[PDB]
Amino acid sequence: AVPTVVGIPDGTAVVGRSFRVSIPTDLIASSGEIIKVSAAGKEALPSWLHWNPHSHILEGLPLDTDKGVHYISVSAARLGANGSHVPQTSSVFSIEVYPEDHNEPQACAADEPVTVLTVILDADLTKMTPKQRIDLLNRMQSFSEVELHNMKLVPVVNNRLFDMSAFMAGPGNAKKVVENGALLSWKLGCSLNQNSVPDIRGVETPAREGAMSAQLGYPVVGWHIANKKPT
């Protein structure tokens, strides 16, 4: 009698940046009902998302191939005496994945380069689940002193494991690079130079000694600091 309708607001995401939203399951599910979260019209989520049923958190880390709008269905079903799932309600919202974070947490002055620290990892993000992508970011926090949601994680492109414009850099623990590679990066400041970069020993030393890779779960190829043209 008199069903309730819950609207969930649409969200936004950016390639290479962590995504996290709470879903109001206590409003959608009358006691006893089973919640399902999927891509609308499918049983699975999009490949970049992960649903935590006990925390009610939908989270993910999109790749360039996830650009665009994703409709997500949150549905509640009654479990019948015979084991059937009787759907009761469905609430659908969308998430638009945008292509570029412009190296900004979300800023430097216009046309002022952003100083970015990048760690190059022997990893293939397309082989990793969303949870694995997020946990790699989580594991980097000890070293970056940047929160999960302000780091960036994207694949290597054109097989380039270096940045020749970098004015500081150093080695990791890896001797071979087996996978395509991943770039895990964050902002240090605006238009910095060697003399104004913060203390980076807490990156460079564990990178070279192998303590960083032991904590991240992936081999570290190297790191570098470079000023990136603004976008």
Author numbering: 58 to 163, 179 to 303
Reproduce text from the manuscript describing this model.
Dystroglycan (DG), a ubiquitous membrane receptor belonging to the glycoprotein complex associated to dystrophin, plays a crucial role in the stability of the plasma membrane, especially in skeletal muscle tissues where it is highly expressed. A single gene, DAG1, encodes for a protein precursor, which is proteolytically cleaved in two subunits, alpha-dystroglycan (α-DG), located at the extracellular side of the plasma membrane where it binds several extracellular matrix proteins, and beta-dystroglycan (β-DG), which is a transmembrane protein that interacts with dystrophin in the cytoplasm. The molecular structure of the N-terminal region of α-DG (α-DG-Nt) was later determined at high resolution by X-ray crystallography, revealing the presence of two domains, an immunoglobulin-like (Ig-like) domain and a domain similar to the small subunit ribosomal protein S6 of T. termophilus (S6 domain), connected by a flexible loop. Noteworthy, it has been shown that α-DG-Nt is necessary for recruiting LARGE and some pathological conditions that are caused by missense mutations in the DAG1 map within the α-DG-Nt.
The crystal structures of D109N and V72I have been determined to a resolution of 1.70 Å and 1.80 Å, respectively. The Asp109→Asn mutation introduces local changes on the molecular geometry that are quite evident in the final refined model. The Asn109 side chain rotates nearly 120° around Cα-Cβ with respect to the orientation held by Asp109 in the WT. The conformation assumed by Asn109 allows for the establishment of H-bonds with Lys203, Glu116 and His107. Accordingly, Asn109 is not engaged anymore in H-bonds with Ser112 and His111 as Asp109 is in WT. In addition, the H-bond network involving Asn109, Glu116 and Lys203 in D109N abolishes the interaction between Lys203 and Glu116 observed in the WT structure. In this respect, it must be emphasized that the Asp109→Asn mutation not only changes the H-bond network involving residue 109, but also modifies the local electrostatic potential, so that the interaction of Asn109 with the surrounding positively charged residues like Lys203 and Arg77 is affected. This is confirmed by the presence of two water molecules (HOH 548 and 621) absent in WT structure and coordinating Arg77, thus filling the void left by the Asn109 side-chain relocation. In details, the mutations Asp109→Asn and Thr190→Met led to a significant increase in the maximum dimensions (with Dmax increased from 90 ± 3Å for WT to 95 ± 3Å and to 100 ± 3Å for D109N and T190M respectively) and in the Rg values (from 25.20 ± 0.04Å for the WT to 26.40 ± 0.04Å and to 27.20 ± 0.04Å for D109N and T190M, respectively), suggesting a more extended shape of the two pathological mutants compared to the WT protein.
